[PDB]
Design a protein around this nucleic acid. Structure first.
Ligand code: APC
Ligand code: MG
Ligand code: MG
Length: 829
DNA sequence: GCCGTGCGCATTCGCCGTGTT
DNA sequence: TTTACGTTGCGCACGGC
RNA sequence: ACACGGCGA
C-alpha cells in the first residue's frame, strides 16, 4: 500500500488513514519521545541529587577525557617530589598507597559528586570527602590483591550483590571483622584527609582545569564549559531512549535496514536488526533478503485491539487486597514478621524488590491497555535482535506476560466456525494447563467444564477459577469467547488469538537438521498417540534414580536421605526443564546446579512449600547430576551437533600463528551464516577494549588501553564458542517463524498473527491453516537445505586454513522422516 | 614439544527500573 | 541510617623439563 | 560496555 515515495509524513498518513489518525499516530511517536526524556530527566536528577553524576552517561564522555590528564599529572608530581632533596608533603604519603588510577578517578568522581549534590561545596568539604574517598581504598586490597582469591569467590560475590553505596561501605565492615591475617589500620586522621584532598583538588586544576576556585575556606565550582557539557550530553542522551508505544495505524513498512515501524522521521530512526555497532547494522545495508522483509512487514500489519471485557476484570482485580490469581503482585509489602526471627524473614526484603518492580510493569501495561481501549485497532512495529528473532518494538506488546496477552486480542476476527470452535476449546484447555494430553481429552476438559466456563464468563468477578489456571487472563479471555459461541453459535465473530506453540523448539530444530528420530520422537516430530513431553521423560528418569535408595543412596558423612528430600518435594517436569532445553545449547552440570537451585529451590525456599532441603547447595548439586545423567542419555545427536558448531566457532575464533616464526597466519574472525529465508547472521563477540578497574565503593570505570593495540577490538574466542550453538538454532527458529508467517499469508491468506518466537497464533477461523503452515515450513525448510552443511561451506573455503583442520565431521543424518511432522499433532511449531 | 600446576568461566538474547530504610 | 546460612569439573596460559 | 531486581524467549 506504500511504495518508494512516502518521504514526507502526515501527508502520507492522512491521505491514507485520514488526518485525524495521522495526527494521533504522530502525536504518539512524539509522546514516546517525550515520556522517554521525562524518564531520563527524572533519573538524571535522582542521581544528581544523590552524588552519582559520574555514573550518568552524560559525564562519562568528559571523565574519559580528564581521567588520563589527571593520572598524567599525578605521576609527574611524584617524580618531581623525588627531585626534592628534603621533606615531602603529607600528600605524597597518604596517596602513594592506592593505584594512581583510583586516585584520579576517585578525585574527578567525588569532586563532581559533592559539587552537584549540595550547595556547600567548599575545599574543606570536598577534600574531606576525597580524603575519606581515597582512604576508603588506600590499597587495602588485602583480599583483592596479595593473591587472596578469597575475594573473587566469597568477598566479591557479595559486594556486587549488596545494593547502595551505603551498604557496600557497611557490609564491607563485615568481611573486615574477621582477622584475615595482618590486621590494624591507622586512620588517616580527620586532619590528613583534607590535605590528601587538597593536593588532589590541585593537579585537577593543574591538569583538567575542571573545577575552579572562587574568591567570595573556599567554595568549589565548575567551568562554564565542563558544566554545560554534561548538561549538553544530557539533552543529547535524553532524546534517544523513547518509551515506544503501539501504533494507531499500520506500521510503516520496512524497505531498508532503517526507517521502519514508526512514521515520524527523526534523527534516530528504527533499525531492522538490533545490533550494537553501527558497523554491524550497515552490514545489512545491501543484503538482499526479500522474504525476511516480508515476514517483518506482514507480521507488523497485524491489527490488534484491547480486550475490553478482559480489561474490565484486570483493572479492578489487580487492586484487590487478595487477588485470586496467585501470580499478580500485591499493592502492599510483605509485612515483616516471620539467628533471631529475622533469620527466616530475611528474604522478605529482596522478595518485595521483585514485587514492587514487577508491580511497575503491571501498572504500565494496564496504563497502555486502558489508554488504547476504544481504538478500533492498534499495531506493533517489529524488528529483530541480530540472530533474526522477531520482537515487537513497544514495551506493551502481544509478547508480554499473561495479563498482557490477555489484554490483547486480534482486531480482525471472523465467524468462528466448526473448526475454529474446536480450535479454541484446545486453546482454552491449553490456557488451563490441560495441554500434555491428546486433543480429545482436552476437548473433554472444556466440555466437561462447560458450566465453570460460563460462570467465569458471566461473573468473572464473582466466579473465579479461571484465575486458578496456569494462564488466568488468557483462559478468562477464552471463557468470554466460549460463552459468546454459546449465546450466538458458530457464526460468532471471534478474534481471540489461538496460540500454537512448539514443544521444545530447541531440540526439535536440532532433531530436524539432523533427522534425529529419537530426539524428534521426544519432541513430538512424528505422529504419536499421546503427546511426548521430553521434560516429563527426563523427570521420570530422574525419579527412577531417586526411587533407588542404596543402589544410589549412601550414608551421610549423603545421597539416600538427600534423594528422600526430593522425593518428598515431588520432583516433576517443573524442575529439570530449563536444564533439558539448554544442554544442547552448552549448559553443563555446573549450570544445572545454579538453574535448579535458582529455578526450583531458591523460590521454593522463601515460601514454606519447600523447607526440607537443609541448605540448597548439594541438594541442588545432587539434582544437577541426576538431570545430567538422565538428560545426557536422552539428548544425543543434539549435543553432537552442538559440539560441531563449537568446533567451527573455536577454530574460526582462534588466532593461528606459524609454529617456527609465529607471525599471525590467520586472524581471529567472526562465525557467519545465513538463515534459510535469506537472513544473514554475524556473530563476532569482542573482548572489552578498555580494561576495567573496580574500586569497591565508588563503582567501576574503564580507560584507554596502555599498550597501543586495539585496531578492531579483539574478538572474544570464548563467547564466540559458548554462543554459537544457542544463537544458531535461535536464528533457525526465527527464520522458521518468519518463513511460516510468509507461508501462512501467501498460501493461506492469513492476515492476523500472534507471534512469540516459537509460538504461532491467529484467530480461530484460521488456526487450522496456521496448524498446517507451521509444519509445512518446518518440513520444506529442513528438506530443501542442510543448514549445517551450508554453514560449513560458509567458513570452509573462507578464512579457516593455516593448519586448521581438526574440524569434526558434520554429524551423520538420522532416520527421521521430516514429512511426518505434517502428521504430528503435538509438534505445533 | 609430552602431559604437570593453575586462574578463569559456568548458555543466550531482549529490555525496564531504582540504586533505600 | 541494622536483610543476605553457602559451592565444582574441562581448558587455554605462561613454562621448567 | 560491567553490575542488582523483574519481565520475555
Ligand atoms: N533460557 C533459555 N536459554 C536459551 N534459549 C532459550 C531459553 N529460554 C527460551 N529459549 C528459547 O525460547 C523458546 C521458547 O521458550 P519456552 O517456551 O520457555 C520453552 P518450551 O521449550 O516450550 O518449554 P515448556 O514445555 O516449559 O513450555 C525455547 O524453546 C528456546 O528455543
Ligand atoms: Mg515453547
Ligand atoms: Mg513458547
Amino acid at each position: 500500500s506504500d511504495i518508494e515515495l512516502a518521504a514526507i509524513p502526515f501527508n502520507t498518513l492522512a491521505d491514507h488513514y485520514g488526518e485525524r489518525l495521522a495526527r494521533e499516530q504522530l502525536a504518539l511517536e512524539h509522546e514516546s519521545y517525550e515520556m522517554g526524556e521525562a524518564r531520563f530527566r527524572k533519573m538524571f536528577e535522582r542521581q544528581l541529587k544523590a552524588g552519582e553524576v559520574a555514573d550518568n552517561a552524560a559525564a562519562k564522555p568528559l571523565i574519559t577525557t580528564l581521567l588520563p590528564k589527571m593520572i598524567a599529572r599525578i605521576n609527574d608530581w611524584f617524580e618531581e617530589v623525588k627531585a626534592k632533596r628534603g621533606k615531602r608533603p603529607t600528600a605524597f604519603q597518604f596517596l602513594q598507597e592506592i593505584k594512581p588510577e583510583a586516585v584520579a578517578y576517585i578525585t574527578i568522581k567525588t569532586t563532581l559528586a559533592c559539587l552537584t549534590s549540595a550547595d556547600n561545596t567548599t575545599v574543606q568539604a570536598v577534600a574531606s570527602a576525597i580524603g575519606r574517598a581515597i582512604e576508603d581504598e588506600a590499597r587495602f586490597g588485602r583480599i583483592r590483591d596479595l593473591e587472596a582469591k578469597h575475594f573473587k569467590k566469597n568477598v566479591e560475590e557479595q559486594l556486587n550483590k549488596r545494593v547502595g553505596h551505603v551498604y557496600k561501605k557497611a557490609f564491607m565492615q563485615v568481611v573486615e571483622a574477621d582477622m584475615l591475617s595482618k590486621g590494624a589500620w591507622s586512620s588517616w586522621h580527620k586532619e590528613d584527609s583534607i590535605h590528601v584532598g587538597v593536593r588532589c583538588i590541585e593537579m585537577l586544576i593543574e591538569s583538567t582545569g575542571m573545577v575552579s576556585l572562587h574568591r567570595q575556606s573556599e567554595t568549589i565550582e565548575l567551568a562554564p564549559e565542563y558544566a554545560e557539557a554534561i548538561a549538553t550530553r544530557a539533552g543529547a542522551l535524553a532524546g534517544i531512549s523513547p518509551m515506544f508505544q503501539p501504533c494507531v495505524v499500520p506500521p510503516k513498512p520496512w524497505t531498508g535496514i532503517t526507517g521502519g515501524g514508526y512514521w515520524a522521521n527523526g534523527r534516530r530512526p528504527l533499525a531492522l536488526v538490533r545490533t550494537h555497532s553501527k558497523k554491524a547494522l550497515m552490514r545489512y545495508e545491501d543484503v538482499y533478503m526479500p522474504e525476511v522483509y516480508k515476514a517483518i512487514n506482514i507480521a507488523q500489519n497485524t491489527a490488534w485491539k484491547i480486550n475490553k471485557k478482559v480489561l474490565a476484570v484486570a483493572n479492578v482485580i489487580t487492586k484487590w487486597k487478595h487477588c485470586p490469581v496467585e501470580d499478580i503482585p500485591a499493592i502492599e509489602r510483605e509485612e515483616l514478621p516471620m539467628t533471631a526471627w529475622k533469620r527466616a524473614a530475611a528474604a522478605v526484603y529482596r522478595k518485595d524488590k521483585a514485587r514492587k518492580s514487577r508491580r511497575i510493569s503491571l501498572e504500565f501495561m494496564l496504563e497502555q491497555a486502558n489508554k488504547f481501549a476504544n481504538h478500533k485497532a492498534i499495531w506493533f512495529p517489529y524488528n529483530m535482535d541480530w540472530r533474526g528473532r522477531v520482537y515487537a518494538v513497544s514495551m506493551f506488546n502481544p509478547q508480554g506476560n499473561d495479563m498482557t496477552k490477555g489484554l490483547l486480542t486480534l482486531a480482525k476476527g471472523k465467524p468462528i466456525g466448526k473448526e475454529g470452535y474446536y480450535w479454541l476449546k484446545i486453546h482454552g484447555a491449553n490456557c488451563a494447563g490441560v495441554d500434555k494430553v491428546p486433543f480429545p481429552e482436552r476437548i473433554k476438559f472444556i466440555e466437561e467444564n462447560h458450566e465453570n466456563i460460563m460462570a467465569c464468563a458471566k461473573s468473572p468477578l464473582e466466579n473465579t477459577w479461571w484465575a486458578e489456571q496456569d494462564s488466568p487472563f488468557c483462559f478468562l479471555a477464552f471463557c468470554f469467547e466460549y460463552a459468546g459461541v454459546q449465546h450466538h453459535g458458530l457464526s460468532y465473530n471471534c478474534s481471540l488469538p489461538l496460540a500454537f506453540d512448539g514443544s521444545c523448539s530447541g531440540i526439535q530444530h536440532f532433531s530436524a537438521m539432523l533427522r534425529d528420530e529419537v530426539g524428534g520422537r521426544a519432541v513430538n516430530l512424528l505422529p504419536s498417540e499421546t503427546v511426548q513431553d521430553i521434560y516429563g521423560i527426563v523427570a521420570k528418569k530422574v525419579n527412577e534414580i531417586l526411587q533407588a535408595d542404596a543402589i544410589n543412596g549412601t550414608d551421610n558423612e549423603g545421597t539416600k536421605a538427600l534423594a528422600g528430600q526430593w522425593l518428598a518435594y515431588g520432583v516433576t517436569r517443573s524442575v529439570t526443564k530449563r536444564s533439558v532445553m539448554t544442554l544442547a545449547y552448552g549448559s553443563k552440570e555446573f549450570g544445572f546446579r545454579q538453574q535448579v537451585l535458582e529455578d526450583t529451590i531458591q523460590p521454593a525456599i522463601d515460601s514454606g512449600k519447600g523447607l526440607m532441603f537443609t541448605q540448597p547447595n548439594q541438594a541442588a548439586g545432587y539434582m544437577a547430576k541426576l538431570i545430567w545423567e538422565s538428560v545426557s542419555v536422552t539428548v544425543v545427536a543434539a549435543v553432537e551437533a552442538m559440539n560441531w558448531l563449537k568446533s567451527a566457532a573455536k577454530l574460526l575464533a582462534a588466532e593461528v600463528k606459524d609454529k617456527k616464526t609465529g607471525e599471525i597466519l590467520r586472524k581471529r574472525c567472526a562465525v557467519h551464516w545465513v538463515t534459510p529465508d535469506g537472513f544473514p547472521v554475524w556473530q563476532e563477540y569482542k573482548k572489552p577494549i578498555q580494561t576495567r578497574l573496580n574500586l569497591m565503593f565508588l563503582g567501576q570505570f574503564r580507560l584507554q588501553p596502555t599498550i597501543n593495540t586495539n585496531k578492531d577490538s579483539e574478538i572474544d574466542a570464548h563467547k564466540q564458542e559458548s554462543g554459537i550453538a544457542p544463537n544458531f538454532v535461535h536464528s533457525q527458529d526465527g527464520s522458521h517463524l518468519r518463513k511460516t508467517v510468509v507461508w501462512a499469508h501467501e498460501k493461506y491468506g492469513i492476515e492476523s498473527f500472534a507471534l512469540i518466537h516459537d509460538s504461532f497464533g491467529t484467530i480461530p477461523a484460521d488456526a487450522a491453516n496456521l496448524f498446517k503452515a507451521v509444519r509445512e515450513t518446518m518440513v520444506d525448510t529442513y528438506e530443501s537445505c542442510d543448514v549445517l552443511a551450508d554453514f560449513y561451506d560458509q567458513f570452509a573455503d573462507q578464512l579457516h586454513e593455516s593448519q586448521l583442520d581438526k574440524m569434526p565431521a558434520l554429524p551423520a543424518k538420522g532416520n527421521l522422516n521430516l514429512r511426518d511432522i505434517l502428521e504430528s499433532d503435538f509438534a505445533f511449531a
